[PDB]
Structure formats: structure tokens, C-alpha cells
Amino acid sequence: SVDLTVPWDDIEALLKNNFENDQAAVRQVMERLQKGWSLAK
Amino acid sequence: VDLTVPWDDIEALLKNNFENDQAAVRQVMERLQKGWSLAK
């Protein structure tokens, strides 16, 4: 049931660029966005 | 809502992905930001 139709992979590529290729930051933001998506619906 | 997250750039990406559908972009931006503020 985990959401797959938001373009998560494209969002991740955007975030990796924005955060200067900081993997830890990308992981933190992707985790919270996807957790939040589930909690908000 | 943490403004270090590049919400405007995410919106531009969604607009392309959803064929410029305003309603879809709104739906997704609403839920992403509601979820961000809820989630820790």
C-alpha cells in the first residue's frame, strides 16, 4: 500500500542536486516526505 | 514546513510530470506539505 505514483525517483534526483549530493540529507528528506504522505491521507 | 526543502522546484517537477494539470499539482503539493508538517 506504500505510495508509488508520486514521482518519488524524480523528486529524489532533484533533492540530491539541491543538497550538494549529501546522501544523508537526501535520505532524511525522502523519509519524511514519504512518511508524511502516508500520515496525511 | 521547512523552507530548506525546495518546494517551488518540486512544484515545477510535478507540473511537468502531471501534464500541467493544475488540479493534480495542487493535490500533490497539498498532501506533501501537510505530511511534512505532520511527520517528524
Swiss-Prot record, chain A:
Organism superkingdom: Eukaryota
Cysteines paired by S-S bonds: none
Localisation: Cytoplasm, Cytosol; Nucleus
SUBUNIT field: Interacts with GET4.
Other comment: Present with 6510 molecules/cell in log phase SD medium.
Protein function: Required for efficient mating. Involved in the production of alpha-factor, the KAR9 and TUB1 location to the shmoo tip and nuclear migration into pheromone-induced shmoos.
Protein name in the entry: Ubiquitin-like protein MDY2
Species annotation: Saccharomyces cerevisiae (strain ATCC 204508 / S288c) (Baker's yeast)
Gene: MDY2
Parent-record interval covered: 175 to 212 of 212
UniProtKB/Swiss-Prot annotation, chain B:
Subunit details: Interacts with GET4.
Protein name: Ubiquitin-like protein MDY2
Record localization: Cytoplasm, Cytosol; Nucleus
Name of the gene: MDY2
Additional record remark: Present with 6510 molecules/cell in log phase SD medium.
Source species: Saccharomyces cerevisiae (strain ATCC 204508 / S288c)
Superkingdom of source: Eukaryota
Coiled coil stretches, renumbered: none
Function: Required for efficient mating. Involved in the production of alpha-factor, the KAR9 and TUB1 location to the shmoo tip and nuclear migration into pheromone-induced shmoos.
